[PDB]
Ligand binder design. Sequence first.
Ligand code: CLA
Ligand code: CLA
Ligand code: CLA
Ligand SMILES: CC1=C(/C=C/C(C)=C/C=C/C(C)=C/C=C/C=C(C)/C=C/C=C(C)/C=C/C2=C(C)CCCC2(C)C)C(C)(C)CCC1
Lengths: 153, 160, 169, 125, 165
Amino acid sequence: ELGVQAPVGFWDPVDGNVASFRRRRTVELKHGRISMLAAMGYMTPEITGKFPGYLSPSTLLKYDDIPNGLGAISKVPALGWAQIFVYCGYAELSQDQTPGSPGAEGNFGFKVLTSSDPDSLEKKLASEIANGRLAMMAFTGMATQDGLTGSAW
Amino acid sequence: FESELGVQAPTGFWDPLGFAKDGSMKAFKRRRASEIKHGRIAMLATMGYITPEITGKFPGYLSPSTLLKYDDIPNGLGAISKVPALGWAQIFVYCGYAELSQDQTPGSPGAEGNFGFKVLTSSDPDSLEKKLASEIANGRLAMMAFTGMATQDGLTGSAW
Amino acid sequence: FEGELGVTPPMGYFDPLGLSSDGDKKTFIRRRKSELKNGRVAMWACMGWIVPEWYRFPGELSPSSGLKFSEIPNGMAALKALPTEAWAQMGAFVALLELGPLWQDESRAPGDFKTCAKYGFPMGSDSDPVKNQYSLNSEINNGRLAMMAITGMVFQNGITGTTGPEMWA
Amino acid sequence: VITLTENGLFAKQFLSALAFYREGLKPWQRGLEIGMAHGYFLIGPFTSLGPLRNTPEAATVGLLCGCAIVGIVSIGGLIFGSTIKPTRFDKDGDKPGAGFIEMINWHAVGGLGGAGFAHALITVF
Amino acid sequence: REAPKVLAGTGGPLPESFWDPAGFTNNKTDEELLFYRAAELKHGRIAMAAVVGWFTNASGFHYLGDLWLKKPASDNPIEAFNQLSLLGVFQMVFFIGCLEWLTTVPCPPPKDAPWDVIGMSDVLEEDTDENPMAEYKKIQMQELNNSRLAMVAIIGLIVQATTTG
Ligand code: CLA
Ligand code: CLA
Ligand code: CLA
Ligand SMILES: CC1=C(/C=C/C(C)=C/C=C/C(C)=C/C=C/C=C(C)/C=C/C=C(C)/C=C/C2=C(C)CCCC2(C)C)C(C)(C)CCC1
């Protein structure tokens, strides 16, 4: 059920239970979301440029001066990425997995699945997790590229 | 309590100072949880010094903004002032969660050293006590090894 | 009150002036708590006079005064040579002990404290007077001996005026 | 009519635990405690801002004045115990007011002691 | 919930949201949960006074400490603590020690509500139905929510002061 895919089965040459799988599923979907955000997030300081601007703390009218895939810092936007880190925690402590009764359901705040286009279960739940797995490898592979093989593109 | 995982063989119920004449049953598990947590930290701490000595320092940059090639940070005491406070904050945060995770409150499954690692879960071949006792015994050795190692790095001056 | 933990072969049940002829079990409990506590203070005080005459702690008592442990006079002259903030902090700490950890519970044994071990070792046990009748008596007699001694040493300092060889001939 | 400051749990337990009300205290113990408090406090108003506040001694004068105040209030308490004769501290089958008189006498003793202790602390420190 | 019902309707963003995103309360007994609240309220009540004391001292009002040191102490409350004479600090500790002794041993709060250090439970109702009163649950929210904010606020003051001035 759920994230069981098509090209492979349970792909468990190492969980394999119910409660332990549920916690592992929450980790899997969670890591999937970030990679998809990070992967599309990394392509944007590329084409369309380092889009940002406007009056920021110690970064007023900063055109996203955090360059390169790692972002570096030097008081350029990457220090502001800590605000992203802080506010990411706020959503991680308010809309979290302790009251997240299913695997990684946040009650669908946007209601995108209320016929707006996504659907409950079936391919959509399987498509989300499968896409997350691809992005996680893509983001890690992109990390290797920036480190010792130039930049993204 | 005289029959738990701690009594290995070379010493019996080794409580010379009498923490067990009044040690309550929950106090044992509380102190056992302290011992297991202390031992696991010490094993990680020990590896954290002997491994950067033989294996070279991390090939990388540690802080992408403040030029830390891992080589300007010495292995041992004094690295606390070399590693950034944020890399110190971030490890503090990571360890902060690892206890603010599934709870280790008194009576909880986290209160007896069980957290859900299960790297070595032998199929109950009379080895659950073996792996448990080995972890406790090694943690006891690791704590003693670390304190000597800390005194080695301090009294001599650097490393060993 | 013969059989109470304080009767010893040298005097049996001493009570020469007869200060406890009537029962007054409350009076005995109060006086016993005083006897133990005064003994423990005297015992710690008696060691407090002997040790400085041999050894002095290395560092400085008040680093922002030049004052180091060595130059503080011994005996009842450190009271006017150790800075008042120093002595006030001992009073605050003894206040913590008397109000917090070393708080004699009414239901407990006379000298029993709910946070101290068998000879006083910090971090403790509930008392077992019957088994420990030997050491409980030993503490009282040692406290009784110390109270005589510390009253001596202070008196010796009061007359001789020092803490050296003359104070203890 | 119950109010927080007199009928609340903290207020009740604070009033009951005062030396005048504490259970299990012999009358001389209540007197000693109250007297120690009064004698220790009463030294201050005289040794400071007193007629001889700037003299080299300036504290023995305060000690004498505090002991005098303690003695005067103790005499007043003796008058009260010999005229009103409260019987709430007397044990059964005793001369009426004996408990109050004992409390007042030991208040005088405790006032002397507290005044002397405050003076000793001031002189030594 | 069962046992967390004794501290129910008293936390969260909205008043009836048991937050606990760490399981710190589940599997814990009723007395432990009550003791956990007693720690929370005591921290928060001190934090509220701590923040107020920080601001009346960081603005330039340290009279007792300017009149005891015979010089205007620095506005930075952390640095003013050092300048404050050691006699003042020791007396400050002793006064709180007396208060902590007083509340605990002589005038103990109840065991069902271990935060009633003033002891309103013997004159309070807390279970009537009047509107122009019986809003005691609401004022419990305002104490807790304000105190929780003060706890993270005072830590921010200390952390920033000890680091980025
Ligand atoms: C955060 C990472 C993460 C987590 C927690 C999971 C969790 C899960 N996956 Mg999953 N997956 C991931 C990443 C992850 N996945 C990625 C990136 C891919 C793409 C290759 C996949 C592809 C995948 C498939 C195809 C299937 C699953 C399945 C599952 C479920 C059972 C499998 C299991 O027990 O694995 C347990 C595994 C571990 C405990 C090992 C964790 C990974 C180790 C630590 C490292 C692995 C090597 C890594 C590449 C080296 C990193 C180097 C780095 C240190 C620098 C479980 C919910 C199966 C499923 O749907 O079951 C219902 C299934 O069929 N996954
Ligand atoms: C954090 C340290 C710690 C803690 C909490 C425990 C806790 C426990 N150990 Mg244990 N142990 C430790 C370290 C520790 N151990 C080390 C390092 C060794 C190796 C020598 C052992 C060897 C050992 C054996 C062989 C056995 C136990 C047993 C036990 C259990 C019952 C005994 C007891 O109450 O000990 C309480 C322990 C303490 C209160 C620690 C106090 C340490 C004092 C304060 C200092 C000791 C000197 C120290 C080295 C000075 C360092 C110098 C430094 C200042 C420079 C209990 C769960 C027994 C057991 O499991 O019974 C069922 C058992 O058989 N332990
Ligand atoms: C002294 C700290 C303290 C304590 C003991 C409590 C205790 C309690 N809170 Mg609480 N709270 C606090 C501070 C505290 N709070 C602060 C500062 C906030 C603001 C964010 C809140 C916000 C809050 C909400 C919104 C809710 C509670 C609730 C509760 C109750 C359920 C038990 C619980 O959540 O975990 C009790 C145990 C702890 C809180 C452990 C303390 C934290 C541990 C040690 C890790 C934190 C370390 C931290 C990361 C690093 C310190 C620096 C930091 C400032 C960055 C319980 C009575 C719930 C409740 O009763 O509602 C019905 C609830 O819904 N609290
Ligand atoms: C300001 C304040 C307050 C108040 C306070 C008070 C009220 C205090 C008091 C205090 C006091 C009031 C104290 C006292 C003390 C005392 C003492 C500490 C004493 C002692 C004594 C002694 C020790 C003696 C002894 C003796 C005797 C008995 C006799 C013989 C001789 C001799 C000397 C031996 C309040 C809280 C409201 C609030 C705010 C703060």
